[PDB]
Amino acid sequence: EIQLQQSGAELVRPGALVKLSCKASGFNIKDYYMHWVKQRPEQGLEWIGLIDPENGNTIYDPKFQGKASITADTSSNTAYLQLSSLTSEDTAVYYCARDNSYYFDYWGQGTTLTVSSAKTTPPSVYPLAPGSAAQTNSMVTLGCLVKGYFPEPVTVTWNSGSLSSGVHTFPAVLQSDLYTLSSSVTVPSSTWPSETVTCNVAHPASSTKVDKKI
Amino acid sequence: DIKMTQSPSSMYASLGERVTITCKASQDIRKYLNWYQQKPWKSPKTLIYYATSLADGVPSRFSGSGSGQDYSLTISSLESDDTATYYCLQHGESPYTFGGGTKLEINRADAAPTVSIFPPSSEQLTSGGASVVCFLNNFYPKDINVKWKIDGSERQNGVLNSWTDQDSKDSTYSMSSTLTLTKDEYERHNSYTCEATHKTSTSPIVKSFNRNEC
């Protein structure tokens, strides 16, 4: 029903400017306050500002005065967030949220903004299969190695999300303009190779979508 | 303008234990304080609003109280999936301010990891690279150490280690260790072993394989 769509991911250069969008569905933005929230990598949430889309009032946190500018378009149901003169510190996940007067009831999935001069590099996806039954149980442990991609993020999935039980996705580690990430799924010895176990990888910043059957 | 202090920063508690998180403001915020829960890499979820009211679909084991500048959230009987980061948010004055957050980890009975080791996949060898991956799953406590040995106590450098966050279901942790090499260097060595030391046993777990790939 109600959903706040965000741009998802973008690689921007130090010193430039960027404009992020937040498209609302199911409800009118003129009726609510829309907020913009930031969260740096291993860090806390930070409040950026709000806007009353009805008759355009905006309040920011002094920290972002003349750095952040919020706009909204009642006819396209979209809130906007432009940042300027980007530096490393602006690398974060920016979320938009709906204020119902009591609390933030709907959030967007966020947009990872990476301020850097490295280029976009799509991931190599490699399957991890056992050299005989992974006997550290009567459950076979399989996997996928997603390496050398930039920027973040990637969303790995198994059997299109049908396999969520026994899944372990290990966060990415950066090593020179490149990240490596892995995932493991542990299934019963009765379902493989008999049933198809496939891992789906998607890298938004390069429009790459790969499916590896193991 | 209004500074929020959250305490503690991080805490450990056992299942069925009662927990209390604190938030104090620099000035009376007139009960305009909310609590949010953030599960790793998911947008925040509201637990409590206006100091004591329970938000959408939150269990009754959660409660809140406080007035003036002192506030607290309390979880009566800890459930495994209360692992998350909790934040308080004051909205009594503009700009709205988040406390620094407190991370909650479930203390649990030690568990030994199940180890798996995968040699370089064919797909990758075909491109000049050789990655060797080692999975250490469902162990507790998080404290663990892995070493890679190539042809003897001759251990190496060029490894990427990553830990998941704590499991919401069974409260364990998992780790991925990847030794990355060139096809070239891989084919000059015989045995690859990754050893792990974890207090659940005085003996190290030596998981091995001989390339002897013909």
Side-chain angles (χ1 to χ4, degrees):
Chain A
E1 206 230 302
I2 293 190
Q3 56 195 99
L4 295 172
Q5 332 272 176
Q6 289 184 66
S7 309
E10 263 188 57
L11 175 57
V12 292
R13 283 56 182 86
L17 71 63
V18 70
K19 197 183 188 195
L20 305 181
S21 56
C22 175
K23 170 199 153 303
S25 312
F27 73 92
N28 211 307
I29 75 172
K30 69 184 303 80
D31 286 309
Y32 304 84
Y33 286 161
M34 303 298 310
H35 297 232
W36 282 96
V37 193
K38 173 186 184 173
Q39 178 164 51
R40 296 194 275 281
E42 308 128 66
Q43 296 181 74
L45 286 168
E46 279 179 81
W47 194 73
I48 290 172
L50 70 76
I51 181 165
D52 176 342
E54 187 85 9
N55 258 83
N57 163 69
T58 56
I59 286 123
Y60 301 89
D61 188 292
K63 180 171 177 74
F64 301 80
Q65 298 295 0
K67 171 72 193 185
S69 157
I70 308 174
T71 53
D73 200 338
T74 279
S75 283
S76 48
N77 250 178
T78 300
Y80 293 102
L81 195 246
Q82 175 179 298
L83 305 165
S84 66
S85 308
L86 305 158
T87 61
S88 287
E89 286 236 349
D90 291 305
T91 302
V93 174
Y94 297 76
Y95 306 87
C96 57
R98 191 187 90 167
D99 179 3
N100 66 29
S101 283
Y102 304 96
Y103 53 84
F104 296 159
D105 50 4
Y106 292 105
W107 297 68
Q109 84 287 358
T111 286
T112 314
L113 195 67
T114 299
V115 183
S116 152
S117 74
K119 66 170 207 300
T120 299
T121 310
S124 335
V125 179
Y126 304 128
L128 306 178
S132 234
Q135 220 316 121
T136 332
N137 216 16
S138 182
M139 301 272 275
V140 57
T141 290
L142 308 147
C144 265
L145 188 67
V146 187
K147 71 175 289 281
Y149 66 87
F150 195 92
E152 277 271 60
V154 296
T155 62
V156 180
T157 222
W158 291 88
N159 280 13
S160 308
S162 299
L163 198 36
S164 48
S165 312
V167 176
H168 278 114
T169 301
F170 305 87
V173 184
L174 175 76
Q175 187 169 6
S176 58
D177 155 57
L178 304 169
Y179 290 96
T180 288
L181 166 155
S182 28
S183 192
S184 78
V185 67
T186 294
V187 301
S189 299
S190 346
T191 47
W192 189 82
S194 332
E195 222 103 29
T196 295
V197 188
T198 300
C199 89
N200 328 109
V201 182
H203 184 226
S206 67
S207 283
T208 315
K209 297 186 179 69
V210 195
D211 289 335
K212 274 268 174 300
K213 204 182 66 184
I214 72 201
Chain B
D1 181 41
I2 144 80
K3 188 159 291 191
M4 303 295 312
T5 296
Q6 221 171 299
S7 337
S9 277
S10 60
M11 50 183 345
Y12 306 71
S14 312
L15 286 177
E17 194 173 308
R18 172 187 75 56
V19 167
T20 299
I21 296 162
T22 301
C23 250
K24 302 158 163 185
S26 45
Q27 69 172 68
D28 168 38
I29 46 180
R30 305 164 302 153
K31 281 172 64 102
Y32 295 109
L33 190 99
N34 294 182
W35 291 90
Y36 285 91
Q37 172 184 252
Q38 186 171 46
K39 281 288 201 167
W41 299 58
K42 285 218 296 68
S43 33
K45 197 181 76 61
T46 164
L47 290 179
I48 293 183
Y49 74 91
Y50 198 60
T52 72
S53 303
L54 242 58
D56 169 51
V58 185
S60 194
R61 58 170 202 273
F62 280 93
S63 106
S65 60
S67 175
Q69 294 161 56
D70 285 74
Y71 299 83
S72 6
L73 174 278
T74 156
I75 313 176
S76 293
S77 173
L78 214 66
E79 221 93 309
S80 63
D81 75 312
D82 289 319
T83 16
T85 306
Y86 299 75
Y87 294 97
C88 69
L89 175 285
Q90 81 71 19
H91 60 287
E93 305 254 299
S94 285
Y96 293 171
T97 298
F98 278 97
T102 116
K103 171 165 191 170
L104 219 205
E105 157 170 335
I106 308 306
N107 216 62
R108 193 215 108 109
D110 300 8
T114 20
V115 182
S116 305
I117 189 176
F118 303 80
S121 75
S122 277
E123 228 253 60
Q124 176 181 216
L125 282 163
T126 255
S127 60
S131 293
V132 194
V133 175
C134 182
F135 285 146
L136 293 81
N137 297 329
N138 306 83
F139 63 85
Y140 198 81
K142 189 165 186 163
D143 290 351
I144 192 161
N145 190 40
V146 172
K147 295 182 180 298
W148 280 92
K149 310 222 183 178
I150 301 185
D151 280 336
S153 51
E154 205 100 290
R155 350 103 33 78
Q156 278 223 183
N157 164 358
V159 319
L160 212 84
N161 294 337
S162 179
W163 277 254
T164 50
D165 295 271
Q166 193 210 286
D167 199 272
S168 296
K169 197 76 175 195
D170 72 11
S171 296
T172 60
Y173 283 101
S174 289
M175 193 204 125
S176 188
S177 184
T178 307
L179 170 70
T180 18
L181 255 42
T182 59
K183 177 190 177 66
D184 304 55
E185 180 176 37
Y186 174 75
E187 288 182 331
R188 196 187 327 155
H189 306 282
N190 199 47
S191 56
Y192 298 84
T193 110
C194 86
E195 305 196 343
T197 62
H198 193 253
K199 276 179 185 178
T200 42
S201 171
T202 53
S203 307
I205 311 161
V206 187
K207 190 51 181 270
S208 214
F209 83 72
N210 305 292
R211 172 181 45 102
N212 280 134
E213 204 58 54
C214 284

